[PDB]
Amino acid sequence: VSSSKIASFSGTKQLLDEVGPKGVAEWVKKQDDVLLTDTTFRDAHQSLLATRVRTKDMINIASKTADVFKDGFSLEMWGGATFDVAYNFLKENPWERLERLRKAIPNVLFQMLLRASNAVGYKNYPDNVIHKFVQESAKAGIDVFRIFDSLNWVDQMKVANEAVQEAGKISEGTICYTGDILNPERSNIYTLEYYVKLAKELEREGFHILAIKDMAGLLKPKAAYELIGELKSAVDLPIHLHTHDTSGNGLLTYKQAIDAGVDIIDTAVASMSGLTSQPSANSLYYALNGFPRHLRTDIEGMESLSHYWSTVRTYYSDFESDIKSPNTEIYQHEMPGGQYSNLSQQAKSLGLGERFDEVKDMYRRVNFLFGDIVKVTPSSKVVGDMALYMVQNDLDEQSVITDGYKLDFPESVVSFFKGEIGQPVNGFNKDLQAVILKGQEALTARPGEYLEPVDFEKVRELLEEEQQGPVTEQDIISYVLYPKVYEQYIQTRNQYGNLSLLDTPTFFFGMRNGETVEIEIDKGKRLIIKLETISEPDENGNRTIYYAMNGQARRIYIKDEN
């Protein structure tokens, strides 16, 4: 779609400019139609393709997405696993993704998923790291921050909320769904009144939008009716539903939440949707025909977007999961997202592949052992690691106490009982906890409290001394989040440059003889590379590559690794 045409659209982006965060929410509330947030750029491929999708594949349909989602509520396109992965595996800069997309899709709000304690990081950070990250993310184009917490501990959500409010952007306060409100015997704790009392709380904390995060796709169709009906009379906040289709019940849940008055839902493009992804927006659009509320979208554009991602998804087939059918066992174990697969590719690497059965079974039990907890990253990693360990050592609800003194529990568990991931809803069994800590003290306050503020001065002078000189705010905050992984990006970038410009089949597979490949640099100016031949190896094992780059004959030397 032409940039001229895109320059003329007004959507939720320029709404935020004119009326501010409280004005956007107000305006969500008055819409009859269900508004949609597309998740193709984050959660769709985070679930289906190990977060591997590359900027280049997104940049390519950005102008079509700007047109197609013009009436969307937001594009969820940053956060989750995408920061780390981009730097680490794709060896590309997730800030360049943010800013290049920002320019191409000027019209629709940008959403990211922001974990309360540590943003997008992997450990715990002092408060001035959270603030720095949100300052810079907002500057770079993020408009809606979906602040969530692994354990639904509200105290841990405040710092991020403050940041977003200061940035003048939209904070969504997230509740994560577990248990089953349809079933009194599932749980005492995770009852309908518990969600109400916690909605009512996030609202007193100033969040503009309320999000129900159903991360293990556990929210049954009727429960979605009940839950959203109660929340809508319990609070003034627009409600924004997020779920996964892993049970195969994603659409029905979305339908029911719609009958019950939900404001925004998260869907994906068809080709990128379903099973562990979100339910398909293309399907829902048709599913609502002849019911009271309509999905606000362009299906013709969506069918066209889906065709694009059909082909691109092909580029990523080495990263597909085994999962090829819905799974209703999730209702028993509650394994959020990918985990079920991330955790069998791991039970095999330990000669347990043959009894992932008993592992599925221990996961559930462990959950009640740790006193019934919300299982998103990283609490799902705590529960998983404990299940592996406990199957492998032939362990018991009782053996874990009796024999705990000599036991040696996986780090991620000691760290949960130490308070380092926050406080569960139901506390810690004190005896379970003693036997795992083996003496060390638990935290009282939220983890971040205990942390020396970071000194960005020292970081800047360390990067400038390492790199040539001139270093930016994004660089500095990136390094604080991912020290090792950031340094590995610079080294890679010195050796090889800006690789996010290659297309994906070239980035993963290289080229073949006779192949010619164009790399777009600017508008109208591309690197034309064609491979004449590959030689045999010299004495010190170097093969010589014979290119014709931009017509010019050219010769490169690569050490063969065998």
């Binding site: 004449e532 014709a548 017509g551 010019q552 004959a553």
Partner: protein, 131 residues
């Protein structure tokens, strides 16, 4: 080419261009320059004779053959020149050793020799040759 009096304007030729049947084939524009006209001619012929273009036929020899011609060196020539000078077309290909020898080595290297078994190539005593 290059050097005294030579000017070259790139056309289609380089490295390993394919030239197509779609456009006027022009590989290089070659101009030469001296104070004498003869001197510019003998400059042209130097330069023409330097060029190597391989993989396609070219018009170099014809061009050499107009340059060398007394009746073009004389200056007194009319647009009837080429038509009333038939011997411009008298073109011997010389025994381009170099090319031929690469064809032979290539051929044997790939398809071996008749009566001769494919082994690791000798010249395998560093005892050179009394003289």
């Amino acid at each position: 080419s290059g050097g005294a009096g030579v000017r070259l304007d790139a056309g289609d030729g380089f490295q390993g261009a394919e030239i197509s049947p779609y456009y006027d084939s022009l590989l290089v524009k070659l101009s030469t320059h001296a104070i004498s006209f003869k001197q510019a001619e003998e400059k042209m012929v130097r330069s023409l004779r330097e060029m190597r273009i391989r993989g396609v036929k070219t018009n170099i020899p014809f061009l050499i053959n107009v340059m060398k011609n007394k009746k073009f060196t004389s200056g007194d020539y009319t647009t009837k020149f080429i038509e009333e000078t038939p011997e411009l077309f008298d073109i011997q290909p010389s025994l381009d050793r170099g090319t031929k020898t690469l064809e032979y080595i290539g051929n044997v290297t790939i398809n071996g020799f008749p009566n001769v078994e494919k082994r690791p190539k000798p010249d395998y005593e560093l005892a050179s040759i009394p003289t």
